[PDB]
Amino acid sequence: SDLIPAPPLSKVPLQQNFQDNQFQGKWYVVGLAGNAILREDKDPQKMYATIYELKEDKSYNVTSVLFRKKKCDYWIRTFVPGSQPGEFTLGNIKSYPGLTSYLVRVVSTNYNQHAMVFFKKVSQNREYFKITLYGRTKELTSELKENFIRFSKSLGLPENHIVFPVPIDQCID
Numbered sequence: 205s206d207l208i209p210a211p212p213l214s215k216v217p218l219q220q221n222f223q224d225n226q227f228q229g230k231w232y233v234v235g236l237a238g239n240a241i242l243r244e245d246k247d248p249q250k251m252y253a254t255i256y257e258l259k260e261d262k263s264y265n266v267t268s269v270l271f272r273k274k275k276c277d278y279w280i281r282t283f284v285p286g287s288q289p290g291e292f293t294l295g296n297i298k299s300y301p302g303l304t305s306y307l308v309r310v311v312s313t314n315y316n317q318h319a320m321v322f323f324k325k326v327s328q329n330r331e332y333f334k335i336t337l338y339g340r341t342k343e344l345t346s347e348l349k350e351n352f353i354r355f356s357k358s359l360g361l362p363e364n365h366i367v368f369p370v371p372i373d374q375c376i377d
């Protein structure tokens with residue numbers, strides 16, 4: 205395989221004065237961009253949700269809920285606070301096969317409507333990155349959608365690497 209290079213981290217803003225308590229709760233994935241994200245026209249990606257629960261020790265318990273093969277499935281993982289507020293690493297990284305590196309950075313949010321989060325991982329020696337556009341509801345304005353496209357492009361991703369998952373009612377509500 206070939207891949208679009210991960211951008212340098214200096215091109216990825218960090219949300220100023222991140223407020224971990226305010227960010228918890230359910231977020232819908234209304235946009236998704238990445239070097240392994242690809243528009244499939246015939247089978248469009250379904251919207252999923254991700255729930256952030258802040259723990260006693262200030263890490264997040266993060267649960268994603270998906271509608272796959274007629275059932276809800278739940279992927280749980282831990283985000284451990286990193287170097288600056290709003291950055292995380294993945295907890296228990298040794299329990300993920302082939303995984304050597306994993307970084308999360310909250311790029312911006314207003315907490316009660318929208319967020320943009322950056323992810324970078326190295327698995328089987330390949331460097332993957334993605335940007336997620338989170339919304340407290342399933343719809344978001346054209347202005348936010350365009351802004352996200354603009355941001356995705358600034359990290360080297362073309363239009364065919366950007367997807368807006370289709371809203372669904374099953375599992376995620």
Ligand SMILES: O=C(NCCCN(CCCCN(CCCNC(=O)c1cccc(=O)n1O)C(=O)c1cccc(=O)n1O)C(=O)c1cccc(=O)n1O)c1cccc(=O)n1O
Binds near residue numbers: 239241254279
């Ligand atoms: O390239 C990225 N993402 C787009 C492809 C997602 N996908 C297509 C859909 C898969 C369905 N699932 C996965 C849900 C279950 N979990 C996993 O099987 C998993 C295993 C090992 C490590 C890990 O971390 N996970 O999640 C999501 O829709 C889903 C929902 C919520 C959070 C989340 O993360 N995912 O993936 C891939 O499987 C894939 C294909 C090829 C390369 C690759 O890296 N991945 O992940 C990426 C770049 C940088 C950081 C990062 O976390 N990701 O995912």
Ligand SMILES: [Cf+3]
């Ligand atoms: Cf992933």
Ligand SMILES: [Cl-]
Binds near residue numbers: 233
């Ligand atoms: Cl996610």
